[PDB]
Amino acid sequence: SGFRKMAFPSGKVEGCMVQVTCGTTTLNGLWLDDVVYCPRHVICTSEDMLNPNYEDLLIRKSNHNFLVQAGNVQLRVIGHSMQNCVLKLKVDTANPKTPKYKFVRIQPGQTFSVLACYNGSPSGVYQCAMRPNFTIKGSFLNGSCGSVGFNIDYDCVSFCYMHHMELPTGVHAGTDLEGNFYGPFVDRQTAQAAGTDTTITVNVLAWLYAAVINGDRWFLNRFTTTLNDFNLVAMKYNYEPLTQDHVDILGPLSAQTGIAVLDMCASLKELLQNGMNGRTILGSALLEDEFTPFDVVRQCSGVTF
Amino acid sequence: SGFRKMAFPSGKVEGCMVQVTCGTTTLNGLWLDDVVYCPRHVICTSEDMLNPNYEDLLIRKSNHNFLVQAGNVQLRVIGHSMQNCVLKLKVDTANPKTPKYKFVRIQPGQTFSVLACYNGSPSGVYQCAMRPNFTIKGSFLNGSCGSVGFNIDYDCVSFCYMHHMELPTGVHAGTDLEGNFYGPFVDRQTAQAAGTDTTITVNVLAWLYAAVINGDRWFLNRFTTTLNDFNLVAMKYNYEPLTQDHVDILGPLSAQTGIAVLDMCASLKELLQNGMNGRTILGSALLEDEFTPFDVVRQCSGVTF
Ligand SMILES: *[C@](O)(C(=O)NC)[C@H](CC[C@H](C)F)NC(=O)[C@@H]1[C@H]2CCC[C@H]2CN1C(=O)[C@@H](NC(=O)OC)C(C)(C)C
Ligand SMILES: *[C@](O)(C(=O)NC)[C@H](CC[C@H](C)F)NC(=O)[C@@H]1[C@H]2CCC[C@H]2CN1C(=O)[C@@H](NC(=O)OC)C(C)(C)C
């Protein structure tokens, strides 16, 4: 038993991390087969940043201007191109540690692990969610740009995030591995504010199921609710609507515990309207929304990779 | 900015994880050079467990009875011995992925990462603290025995924990890599209860410094306290005494923020006596005690490995 915020094992991603330097700027890149992916702003100084013309800056670079280091070893760059907000540096050596991988654009509410890196060297790993407002609540210092987020399914690493920016209040924005930002954000140092965030209702329910599985049952009430009536309450408390798809996705946890989803919704409604009254659930004094149903099953069933 | 519970990158440990089977029992082992370390209870059935005589059970085993698998590959066992609560299986192949390593017995209050594993395959990684009562609040399912806890210092993996048991209320007990339990516990299925736990005061202070560094300052008051007067309050709230060593260890964070440790102690005293009043600190509605001062510096300074 027990329940922790649990990241994927990071080894398969660690073997892909490199350092990319262009001029004065150094950040991280991702080396897969014979391509290194990194944020396009490696080609900028911190005066280009107010509004860089990246296409223009890149035309004045050539392959040799990119210093790519995998540990101690320089990798010779033999081609380069820009795809949205990422650069692809073709190198003359394929990474022998490349795992089976895919690039995937994740949906808001889904979780992933971040391997935070500096100068191509991993610092730590932690689990995040893509927030409904397309930011992530990460932990990043200057030098972490190009760090990636990912999920692992058996042997296959699905890369979903590359770090680019920090927005006001210490939240983070970035791209998929095709270089397309999540959310309305752009890679320039200009006033941009995230939309107002919302709580990921299906994930809160998943975490209440995790609590039940772990024997922390105190909040289960004797009632039920309709989907529509629950959503009227979710709206008031800035929770996202619960859909029938969400109900179906919660099916495995509902079956395991014998608690119908709409019964769990009645218990969550009471928690929203009345509070926790100083009690905890799974050691938390707030309702947690960064565990997906799959995260709960994986952690409560021992899924390995 | 940002602050997350952050585990060490797990790759160097993943490359050491194997499966060990003896008879009906399968669990995880740690393969370093030509030795596999695992819990001695691999030689038990789940009837031996009330009170096994491990020395006696082991005399009736020979090398070939231990099936050790590293991924797809069986490793031939050529020697075995017992050291306290761990078995050491000598194998005929040295692990080529062995990192620089040490075995270290950590002190209560210190943190480490756990790589949870099943059938020799890693499932996830998370950060824990050794509690003052010598348990850890982990996340472990049957099959996770032999999973290890560790810290990384640049290139060197310091292994500090191997998982053996779960105690009432879903907390966990285990050994160092010399097989000596943390705490009074024994590897048998007999009534054992942890001592009453306490809150790790120096770590709470470290986390308040992390909050200040991240701009979450609301709880800083205008006062100071003496060490003695603070400890009288810590005692009442089941917090461990703060020592001068702790004050000195907090020096780097105090210097960074300009807040003297005893001034931060006055702010913590007020939080203990008055509560948070529904506010959060670093996104938490409770005071967090599983970040050490070093954890805060590492995460707020970008230390890599
Ligand atoms: C990376 O570029 C990096 O690590 N480089 C070595 C950094 C990481 C900063 C934090 C830790 F996330 N990101 C930037 O500095 C980006 C930069 C590229 C896109 C536009 C440029 C500014 N920038 C920012 O994050 C700014 N954010 C901002 O303008 O938001 C509207 C701030 C944080 C520098 C003000
Ligand atoms: C490991 O042995 C394992 O994973 N084996 C495949 C397990 C892990 C159990 C949980 C997830 F931690 N541990 C045990 O079952 C141990 C076992 C070895 C030492 C004594 C034996 C009982 N045991 C327990 O953890 C029991 N704890 C207990 O007796 O505490 C006083 C319980 C949890 C099985 C009752």
From Swiss-Prot, chains A, B:
Instruction: State what inhibits or activates this protein.
Output: Inhibited by pyridone-containing alpha-ketoamides compounds 13a and 13b. In turn, alpha-ketoamide 13b (tert-butyl (1-((S)-1-(((S)-4-(benzylamino)-3,4-dioxo-1-((S)-2-oxopyrrolidin-3-yl)butan-2-yl)amino)-3-cyclopropyl-1-oxopropan-2-yl)-2-oxo-1,2-dihydropyridin-3-yl)carbamate) inhibits SARS-CoV-2 replication in human lung cells. Inhibited ex vivo by michael acceptor inhibitor N3. Inhibited ex vivo by compound 11a and 11b.
> Cytoplasmic side of the membrane: what ranges?
1-305
Which chemical reaction does it catalyze?
A: TSAVLQ-|-SGFRK-NH2 and SGVTFQ-|-GKFKK the two peptides corresponding to the two self-cleavage sites of the SARS 3C-like proteinase are the two most reactive peptide substrates. The enzyme exhibits a strong preference for substrates containing Gln at P1 position and Leu at P2 position
User: Where is the Glycyl lysine isopeptide (Lys-Gly) (interchain with G-Cter in ubiquitin) crosslink found in the sequence?
Assistant: 5, 90
**Where would you find this protein in the cell?**
Host cytoplasm; Host Golgi apparatus; Host nucleus
Effect annotated for changing residue 145 to A: Complete loss of 3C-like proteinase nsp5 cleavage
The reported effect of residue 90 to R is:
In strain: Beta/B.1.351
Q: What is this protein called?
A: 3C-like proteinase nsp5
Q: Which organism is it from?
A: Severe acute respiratory syndrome coronavirus 2
Please state which portion of the whole protein this structure contains, as first and last residue out of the total length. 3264 to 3568 of 7096
